[PDB]
Amino acid sequence: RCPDCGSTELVEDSHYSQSQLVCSDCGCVVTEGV
Amino acid sequence: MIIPVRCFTCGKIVGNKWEAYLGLLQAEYTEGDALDALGLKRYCCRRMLLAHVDLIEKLLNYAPL
Amino acid sequence: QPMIYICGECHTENEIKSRDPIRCRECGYRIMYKKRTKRLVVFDAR
Amino acid sequence: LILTRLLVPPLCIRPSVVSDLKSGTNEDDLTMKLTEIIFLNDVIKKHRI
Amino acid sequence: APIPTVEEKWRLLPAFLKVKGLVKQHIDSFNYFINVEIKKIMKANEKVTSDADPMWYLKYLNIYVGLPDVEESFNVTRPVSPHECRLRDMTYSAPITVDIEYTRGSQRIIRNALPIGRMPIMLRSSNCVLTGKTPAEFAKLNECPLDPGGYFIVKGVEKVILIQEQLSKNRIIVEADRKGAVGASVTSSTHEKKSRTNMAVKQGRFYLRHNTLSEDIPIVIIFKAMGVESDQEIVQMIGTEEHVMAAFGPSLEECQKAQIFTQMQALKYIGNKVRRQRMWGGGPKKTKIEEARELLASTILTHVPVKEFNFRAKCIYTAVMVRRVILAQGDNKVDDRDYYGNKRLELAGQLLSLLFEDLFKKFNSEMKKIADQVIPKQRAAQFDVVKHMRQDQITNGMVNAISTGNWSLKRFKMDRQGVTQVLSRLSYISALGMMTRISSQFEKTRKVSGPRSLQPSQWGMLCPSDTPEGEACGLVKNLALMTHITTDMEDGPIVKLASNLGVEDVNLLCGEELSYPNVFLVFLNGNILGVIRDHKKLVNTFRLMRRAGYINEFVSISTNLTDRCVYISSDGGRLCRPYIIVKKQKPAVTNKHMEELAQGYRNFEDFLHESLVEYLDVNEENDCNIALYEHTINKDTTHLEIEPFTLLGVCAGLIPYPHHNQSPRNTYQCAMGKQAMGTIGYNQRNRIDTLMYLLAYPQKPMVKTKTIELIEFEKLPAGQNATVAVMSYSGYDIEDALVLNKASLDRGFGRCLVYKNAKCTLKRYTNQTFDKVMGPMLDAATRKPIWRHEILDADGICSPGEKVENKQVLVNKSMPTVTQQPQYKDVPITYKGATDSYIEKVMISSNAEDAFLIKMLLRQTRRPEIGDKFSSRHGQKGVCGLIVPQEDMPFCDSGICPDIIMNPHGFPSRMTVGKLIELLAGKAGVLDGRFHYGTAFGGSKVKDVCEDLVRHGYNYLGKDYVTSGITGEPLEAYIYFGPVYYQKLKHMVLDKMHARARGPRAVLTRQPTEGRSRDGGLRLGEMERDCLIGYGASMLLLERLMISSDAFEVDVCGQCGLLGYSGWCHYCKSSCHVSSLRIPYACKLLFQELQSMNIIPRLKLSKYN
RNA sequence: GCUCGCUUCG
Ligand SMILES: Nc1ncnc2c1ncn2[C@@H]1O[C@H](COP(=O)(O)OP(=O)(O)OP(=O)(O)O)C[C@H]1O
Ligand SMILES: [Zn+2]
Ligand SMILES: [Zn+2]
Ligand SMILES: [Zn+2]
Secondary structure, three states, rough: OOOOOOOOOOOEOOOOOEEEEEEEEOOOEEEEEE | OOOOEEEOOOOOOOOHHHHHHHHHHOOOOOOHHHHHHHOOOOOOHHHHHOOOOHHHHHHHOOOOO | OEEEEEOOOOOEEEEOOOOOOOOOOOOOEEEEEEEEOOOOOOOOOO | OOOOOOOOOOOOOOOOOEEEOOOOEEHHHHHHHHHHHHHHHHHHHHHHO | OOOOOHHHHHHHHHHHHHHOOOHHHHHHHHHHHHHHHHHHHHHHOOOOOOOOOOOOOEEEEEEEOOOEEEEEOOOOOOOOOOOHHHHOOOOOOOEEEEEEEOOOOOEEEEEEEEEEEEEEEEEEEEEHHHHHHHHHHHHHHOOOOOOOOOEEOOOOOOEEEEEEEEEEOEEEEEEEEOOOOOEEEEEEEOOEEEEEEEEEOOOOOOOOOOOOEOOOOEEEHHHHHHHOOOOOHHHHHHHOOOOHHHHHHHHHHHHHHOOOOHHHHHHHHHHHHHHOOOOOOOOOOHHHHHHHHHHHHHHHHOOOOOOOOOOOOHHHHHHHHHHHHHHOOOOOOOOOOOHHEEEEEOOOHHHHHHHHHHHHHHHHHHHHHHHHHHHHOOOOOOHHHOOOOHHHHHHHHHHHHHHHHHHHOOOOOOOEEEOEEOOOOOOOHHHHHHHHEEOOOOOOOOOOOOOOOHHHHOOEEEOOOOOOOOOOOOOOOEEEEOOEOOOOOHHHHHHHHHOOOOOOOOOHOHHHHOOOOEEEEEEEEEEEEEEEEEEEHHHHHHHHHHHHHHOOOOOOOEEOOOOOOEEEEOOOOOEEEEEEOOOOOOOOOHHHHHHHHOOOOOHHHHHHHOOOEEEEEEEEEEEEEEOOOOOOOOOOHHHHHHOHHOOOOOOOOOOOOOOHHHHHHHHHHHHHOOEEOOOOOOOOOOOOOOOEEEEEEOOOOOOOHHHHHHHHHHHHHOEEEEEEEEEOOOOOOOOOEEEHHHHHHHHHOOOOEEEEEEEEOOOOOOOOOOEOOOOOOOOOOEEEEEOOOOEOOOOOOOOOOOOOOOOOOEEEEEOOOOOOOEEEOOOOOOOOOOOOOEEEEEEEEEEOOOOOOEEEEEEEEOOOOOOOOEEEEOOOOOEEEEEEEEOOOOOOOOOOOOOEEEEHHHHHOOOOOHHHHHHHHHHHHHHOOOOOOOOOOOOOOOHHHHHHHHOOOOOOEEEEEEEEOOOOOOOOEEEEEEEEEEEEEOHHHHHOOOOOOOOOOOOOOOOOOOOOOHHHHOOOHHHHHHHHHHHHHHHHHHHHHHHHHHEEEEEOOOOOOOOOOOOOOOOOHHHHHHHHEEEHHHHHHHHHHHHHHHOOOOOOOOOOO
């Protein structure tokens, strides 16, 4: 779940070679870096 | 691979004069007189037609078909 | 769902399902290409 | 100056790669050296016994 | 009265190319290896038996390699084409089988066809399927008819075995040492052992040094040990010159100081200086003198053979060596290593022969071990080798040695690397030039600068200009256009003719005759063949007999008047070049012979047999007189040069008028042509490689060299002819830059295609589970696949014809995590790319291991822009500085606007007059519809193209009246217009552009990665830090090297000085003195590593005030 | 992902 909005729309979307699991609703970066 | 439609420098339509040029090669015409008869006054179209290699048939020989 | 492929020498439309040994009828070639898609594709003349 | 204990470093100095494509893992040379040292200590103890 | 000249003489060159030339070397070597050498290797190890249980043996009868086949089918073979091996990522090999006879239970059992291995088949070889095929049959097999071949295909990759260069074996080398002492060295190498024995003069006396001796011993003691005990005979063998005796006096005095006067005493003294090879197994039983005699007979000077413990030949050899050292101790006539007459070239044949011999010996040893372990204790069930003949040994050995490229032969103790290299498919010229490469034994790691020089011995053999610019300058070379590498001969008739020609036996006379001024020593591959008088008659008779055909045409004979030695070379690897024989100021080749050759009456072999053209070696041509042209022929001429432009190699042949340019320009042009973009072959569409560059509309050059016609480069061009005007425009072409025309690029000029490969594998594991591809994950909201899975088809594999964007999946691969229900995790093949790509084809194949291999060929169509690198076939590499519109380009009276505007300032510093001559010839040719020739040391002259220009109404110097396109006013100076063959290079700004955000870091040291494919950041090297220090920018250096790279916050205890964690010190078991501190992560790693090394750094912290 | 080798680039 997202720590800010509590949503479950956590998508793994890499932004320019940066692995990043981020919430799809508010854009809160859950996890980043591999 | 294939004859370009437009000349690189000027832009005269040269793709339609390729096969006929080959006909002039199938006839007794040389390179210079054939290029003159085709209407290529400036040397850019002469270089375009003369220095072009017909590689499309060599590739079609390897085509699936 | 009929999945279609093309052989490397016969060039015939062969329908094979999942987990099948890659082969082609009336021959023994083992190179199987995929047919071109039917979706519309837009190209720019630039 | 004479060592009787060996300080094995943390895992940060000895990175381990989990290569799931095969049945093995990629380890640095220090881990193998420490493994061989422990094996030699055990063999020495076994021979002493 | 000028001497008549044969105009058609150059026609001798293509005929030579019909049976020999560029690629025939490796092909012939591989054929000789697989047809003759392999049988000899099998015969050398035909019988293998074990010591236990005698009367048991395994006898090989005959070995075959057969035709290439694939083991895909279940226990069935099938013919496979090399292109299929390229596609399926398998090896192109043929099953090595052998027929044998053995004894199972003392009853002879024979097998007529039992496979034992797989030999990788070289392309276009004798057993290759591609040989003896027509271009139509090549099209049926999806192989280019113009492909040079000669390379191996292993696991889908193309490996080429480079020609190795090494020093000749069994040759005395007189050289100075580190301290200036002029000593000698001889590396006696036989089929079994190679031993380098040296001789020094460190203290005015000669000591002999070998690896089998504890200390170097005087040469006189060795003389006394080898049978000759009288000192007078030793002195006579050394020489009778006064200075020779004066130099050898100290050695005799030192020998007389000791009590060594007989053979037994000398052998005992030598044995005292012999050390055991670390407790050799077996009872010695007083072997000291015996070990000394065995080392003298077998180990020392292996190439010099002793009939039955008769060291007469070895004594004469070491006496000649001492005499050479004495003569060299005066006038500094030190032999040089870079002289290519002492060089030998090993092709793929000899390397493969050694490798196969080693592998077969290992297989025989393994079989003998298995026999010894199985036969004496198993059961009454008689053991047979057939149940234990593993067939994967030789196959895996060959595959690994060819693929990895490192060769480790313990039987010969040879540890080589970089033997095989990936064939470069940048262009046809790239592969054609890489096929004829030669690496040096120096194996560049340091600045030698002694072999890197261009020696005059490379004349006609190796290309002088073609060399990789960089660290490998001078140590990687290319063969000439007309050259040949000799093979090994039988050496029998050579000895017979030498004995019949009056060569006196060396055993019949003493060494004093060696000191006579008219007596010449005759050698043979490093062995003393004997002595002779009037060596001119001997040399003339040997050359005439070689011309007649009774002696092999590759046997070389040379004479050294300084050392008075007649060398007869018959070993393989020597470089030879054909030359026309000249007798009495008139060449043997006439116009009638060339007319018969043109009509087809005779071939090059007929010229060889009729004593018209003969092969000359470097050592042989050292004594011969060669004339470049007919007018240069004088009274003292023995040979005539066939064609001077054959001096250049393959890559250098593309240079139009290379003799009008500078040598660094030619080198840079060769380097860039090795990277020139263009077509690869007629099968370039079905070919799927990891990286391919193709040209949209390639055009053959207008100024083509005869080498281009010979190598058929005009069928596969790698560039385009553009109307270049040499002038300065807008100041965007300051240093090497060029201005491109927008309208030209818009109409297809310079348009290029980049093909990349994306391969995925679905393999079956040990457990009965397999990798499976899921369908496109359709979105339930819109009933359509998601943006990531948009391009996927119904089977989860991307379909050709669509465009792929960044971070899109091509194959929806999911793999199990077990190796009870299987658990699959997704590992899709995402497309990493800045620009979009189009899928041309998707190939799906199945290997024998049920692993599905999927290869997608992505295509990108790129247009020339700012940053693309362009070449002009003259080393004038440039970058597109500005793209101006057509109306901004200047125009002539006819209305022609230039495509490429190049800076004139690049001409004076580089003196590239050849570029101007090529431009003029190309303009004349496109005017009169002809193809002028830029042949080296020849070609069309300037007067002819000037007359062609003046005839057509243009200026006789290329400069034409031009009106400025911008202001509309005529220019004050005429502009040099003309068609130039510009070639685009693979170096693009799109692939080289890089930008690095925070991104990922490395696990060991938390710093950005290295490569762009790894998305790494730039590195501030030591010199950048030095510059930042010199500027005095402390804060910028701190931000770059600490804040932005490896910043971290550690916890240090102020009591013990050690590193804590989470504000706690485990050492002191307290947390009151623990304080945070900023630090580079590499510094913390260093501190931890030092603590691991018992070097404990104790940090005493303090307030910043 | 670590290592090594080749190759290019200025
Ligand atoms: N090994 C190297 N170390 C440092 N810089 C290098 C190296 N190789 C190339 N460069 C860069 O390339 C430049 C070398 O060019 P330079 O030698 O001056 O001209 P050039 O290559 O001789 O061209 P011409 O042959 O004169 O046309 C200078 C340097 O910044
Ligand atoms: Zn034109
Ligand atoms: Zn088929
Ligand atoms: Zn503490």
